[PDB]
Design an enzyme around this catalytic site. Structure first.
Site, PDB file in Angstrom:
ATOM      1  N   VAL A  58      53.316 -17.965  54.992  1.00 55.26           N
ATOM      2  CA  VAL A  58      54.653 -17.331  54.847  1.00 55.26           C
ATOM      3  C   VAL A  58      54.482 -16.038  54.040  1.00 55.26           C
ATOM      4  O   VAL A  58      53.852 -16.060  52.987  1.00 55.26           O
ATOM      5  CB  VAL A  58      55.658 -18.298  54.188  1.00 55.26           C
ATOM      6  CG1 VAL A  58      56.917 -17.570  53.748  1.00 55.26           C
ATOM      7  CG2 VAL A  58      56.011 -19.441  55.116  1.00 55.26           C
ATOM      8  N   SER A 137      48.115 -22.486  55.999  1.00 55.76           N
ATOM      9  CA  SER A 137      49.402 -22.808  55.334  1.00 55.76           C
ATOM     10  C   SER A 137      50.427 -23.204  56.415  1.00 55.76           C
ATOM     11  O   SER A 137      50.069 -24.091  57.214  1.00 55.76           O
ATOM     12  CB  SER A 137      49.792 -21.627  54.471  1.00 55.76           C
ATOM     13  OG  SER A 137      50.851 -21.942  53.603  1.00 55.76           O
ATOM     14  N   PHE A 138      51.614 -22.582  56.531  1.00 54.46           N
ATOM     15  CA  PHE A 138      52.548 -23.011  57.610  1.00 54.46           C
ATOM     16  C   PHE A 138      51.940 -22.677  58.985  1.00 54.46           C
ATOM     17  O   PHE A 138      52.269 -23.327  59.982  1.00 54.46           O
ATOM     18  CB  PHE A 138      53.991 -22.550  57.367  1.00 54.46           C
ATOM     19  CG  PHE A 138      54.439 -21.241  57.957  1.00 54.46           C
ATOM     20  CD1 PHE A 138      53.654 -20.096  57.881  1.00 54.46           C
ATOM     21  CD2 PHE A 138      55.694 -21.134  58.531  1.00 54.46           C
ATOM     22  CE1 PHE A 138      54.096 -18.888  58.399  1.00 54.46           C
ATOM     23  CE2 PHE A 138      56.148 -19.920  59.034  1.00 54.46           C
ATOM     24  CZ  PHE A 138      55.351 -18.791  58.957  1.00 54.46           C
ATOM     25  N   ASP A 161      44.337 -25.296  54.427  1.00 52.85           N
ATOM     26  CA  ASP A 161      45.477 -25.795  53.626  1.00 52.85           C
ATOM     27  C   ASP A 161      46.724 -25.891  54.485  1.00 52.85           C
ATOM     28  O   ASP A 161      47.761 -25.326  54.145  1.00 52.85           O
ATOM     29  CB  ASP A 161      45.671 -24.912  52.397  1.00 52.85           C
ATOM     30  CG  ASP A 161      45.544 -25.662  51.090  1.00 52.85           C
ATOM     31  OD1 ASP A 161      44.776 -26.650  51.050  1.00 52.85           O
ATOM     32  OD2 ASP A 161      46.238 -25.278  50.123  1.00 52.85           O
ATOM     33  N   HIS A 363      45.355 -22.289  47.208  1.00 52.27           N
ATOM     34  CA  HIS A 363      46.031 -22.056  48.501  1.00 52.27           C
ATOM     35  C   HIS A 363      45.587 -20.726  49.117  1.00 52.27           C
ATOM     36  O   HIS A 363      45.490 -20.674  50.361  1.00 52.27           O
ATOM     37  CB  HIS A 363      47.547 -22.117  48.312  1.00 52.27           C
ATOM     38  CG  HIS A 363      48.285 -22.256  49.599  1.00 52.27           C
ATOM     39  ND1 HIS A 363      48.079 -23.336  50.446  1.00 52.27           N
ATOM     40  CD2 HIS A 363      49.197 -21.453  50.200  1.00 52.27           C
ATOM     41  CE1 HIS A 363      48.861 -23.207  51.515  1.00 52.27           C
ATOM     42  NE2 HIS A 363      49.536 -22.037  51.392  1.00 52.27           N
TER      43      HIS A 363
END
Lengths: 420, 418
Positions: A58, A137-138, A161, A363
């Site tokens: 994001v 991530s997303f 992640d 992250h």
């Protein structure tokens, strides 16, 4: 970019968005800004060279991943790179700029999976098998959902992640600590100069590779005016910099509001006012598990994605930051179930799923630990590509004599005729 | 059709097929032959006019559905038709002819869902909301999987005897009767003339609407030569008709083999030769439930689709033939669970799912009972379009004056600062 030719593209995304409030008009054509990274190469491209399809986290511009791309190419062993393709999600980064007059206050992660499926069909002539998914991530969640949309599309997935877990994020409810999501809503989003904006964003940039720092200072901030901040002089007046011809105010290239509605979704109408009982409103929140509706904010995709992991067809590498904010214990249960059921790779028992937990990494490891992240990916890619070469050969062998027009003889042995 | 303008299109399908053996080369570009049916209209198109996306049954040419389209338009009440779009599945009918040098001996129903998603994005300028899905037979299964790919795409689904159930079909194993699938493998597929082919296929055409009969005799058979029968004179020799120079042998437009590998898939390698135990081979059969691997044939999609029904987002009409050969009792359990879970419409409890069982109708009811099938669809479409108009209005009301650029004030009440 050290090692690649860069081609830019602007391609239409998926028709009809998952949430109607994600655009001004429900039939709006969103575009995705794509960079195609082609190795600088003397000879022709080898036959099994990988097309990488990559997704970002994001608010993180696609250009931040360029040092990771250079590292994958420089350390590549047992595979070749045809090209790496990374698009900016429609509501963010350079896509968000192109779409700025069409965006509105909602976001489904599922739409980028459909946007990528279209992109791949658009560029198909440049994307023969094998394809490999990379998601941070997303983006780890999105690339997994793209594999759910098209199970045999990807030979393997590299998840960095990935946001795939059952538990809602922490949101400062009750005794809980506020998370990065609380920070996103309340954060400053405009500064008198780029220099001041960089210093205000030091937390996200700490420990970043210098190559990622330069990309951050260029891509993470945008000169006024923007739709959110359309009046340069009003902002120079607010900061008292009206006399200073040499400074232009900047804002977040991805408005904090577009980060926010991607990190979390409103659940402002879950409770029957008379019983006080949760009743999921199906017109707006059909995708919400009633068990998570007890708070007025939710994120459906980590939980729905986790619950389908047993069906995941591609082999899957799960690279987890030891010092992450993710629910690492839930993620490790996800790894155990990954591909173990119907439609699945075969999972951990068949050696088709592996976890690597990197102690002390955060992250933002793809920007802070570029060499180790690349190395972790290469070891997996070389194993998967050895398996690909072998299984592709066995397939061609098993098919050699076989008709394209009529079924093989065994069919007449197993399926008996109707009694005359 | 006289009631509709017909536009023909040929558009590329989905890149990379679900089964590698579906085509000669894994990167082959299959095309789908599409007919677009636009009502003949004096005035402008009303604002909420429906885009219909329709899918056919195995081996059934899209043109057979034209009388049903005429009836939907003629009986329309409380809705307008912007256009009806039906494509031939890539391995069948006119698509199969265009793709004949690229097709091979496998078929996943999932690929047509992806082909339709591409088609809709290609023609998006002609397809504003609302869209509604119509699927007959395996087309009912495909259109449901398209709704799984894109939950908010369709306002509602009309399923006509959809192939969504848990149990394998009957295939003449053990004591079981051989079925239409056994018939498909073994059936005659070439005739010395079209006249002889028509006479030999009276059974399939029995009770068909006369409008469907003309389309059948034109589209169900193809003059040699074809890839499967590339030699006219060899076939005239086989029938002993070499002296009749003016008569052309015909074959099935959809080769029986393309019907067969859509109806059922080989499971020839499921048993460890030493233990005799089922071990699903994940390289070729990852999509197979081990519980159905006990026989050397399977069909994964009815069962996978059934198991996800609780997530189905669109409202759904299930039109079931009372004399169907499908597992009707399993289908009615599917109806009960349809949309009841996370992602779902709300299902039967919320009035978003309805079954209509038509007593004494068969699987070919869209060609045999055109008026009753149309009427069953109209009653549902009227209710769903009344709900659409109301919910569209409430949405516009709730959004009036809200920012496109920044979140509303309630966010600052619920999400605490640092």
């Amino acid at each position: 970019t050290e090692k690649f030719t860069i081609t830019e593209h602007l391609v239409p995304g998926s028709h009809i968005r998952e949430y109607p409030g994600s655009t001004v008009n429900q039939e709006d054509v969103l575009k995705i800004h794509v960079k195609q990274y082609t190795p600088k190469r003397e000879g022709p491209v080898p036959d099994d060279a990988i097309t990488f399809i990559a997704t970002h986290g994001v608010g993180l511009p696609k250009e931040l991943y360029e040092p990771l791309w250079d590292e994958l190419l420089d350390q590549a062993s047992g595979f070749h790179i045809r090209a790496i393709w990374m698009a900016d999600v429609a509501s963010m980064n350079q896509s968000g700029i192109h779409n700025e007059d069409k965006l509105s206050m909602d976001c489904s992660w599922m739409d980028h999976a459909r946007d990528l499926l279209l992109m791949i069909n658009h560029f198909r002539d440049q994307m023969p098998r094998p394809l490999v998914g990379i998601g941070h991530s997303f983006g780890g969640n999105i690339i997994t959902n793209l594999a759910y949309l098209h199970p045999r599309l990807f030979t393997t997935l590299l998840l960095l992640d990935p946001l795939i877990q059952l538990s809602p994020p922490s949101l400062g409810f009750g005794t809980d600590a506020p998370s990065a999501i609380n920070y996103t809503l309340w954060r400053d989003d405009v500064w008198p100069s780029r220099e001041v904006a960089i210093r205000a964003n030091r937390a996200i940039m700490q420990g970043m590779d210098p190559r990622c720092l330069d990309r951050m200072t260029k891509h993470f901030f945008r000169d006024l005016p923007t739709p959110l901040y359309p009046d340069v002089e009003a902002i120079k007046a607010l900061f008292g910099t009206t006399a200073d011809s040499t400074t232009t105010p900047v804002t977040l290239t991805t408005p904090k509001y577009h980060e926010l509605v991607a990190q979390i979704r409103q659940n402002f109408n879950a409770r029957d006012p008379k019983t006080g009982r949760i009743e999921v409103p199906r017109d707006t929140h059909a995708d919400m598990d009633p068990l998570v509706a007890y708070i007025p904010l939710y994120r459906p995709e980590p939980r729905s994605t986790f619950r389908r992991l047993e069906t995941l067809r591609p082999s899957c590498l799960w690279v987890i930051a030891g010092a992450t904010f993710l629910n690492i214990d839930e993620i490790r249960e996800g790894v155990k179930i990954c591909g173990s059921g119907i439609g699945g790779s075969g999972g951990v028992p068949d050696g088709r799923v592996r976890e690597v937990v990197l102690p002390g990494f955060g992250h933002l490891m793809p920007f802070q630990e570029v060499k180790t992240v690349a190395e972790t990916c290469i070891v997996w890619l070389q194993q998967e590509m050895d398996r690909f070469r072998q299984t592709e050969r066995q397939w061609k062998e098993d098919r050699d004599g076989k008709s394209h027009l009529a079924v093989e003889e065994n069919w007449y042995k197993v399926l008996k005729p109707i009694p005359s």
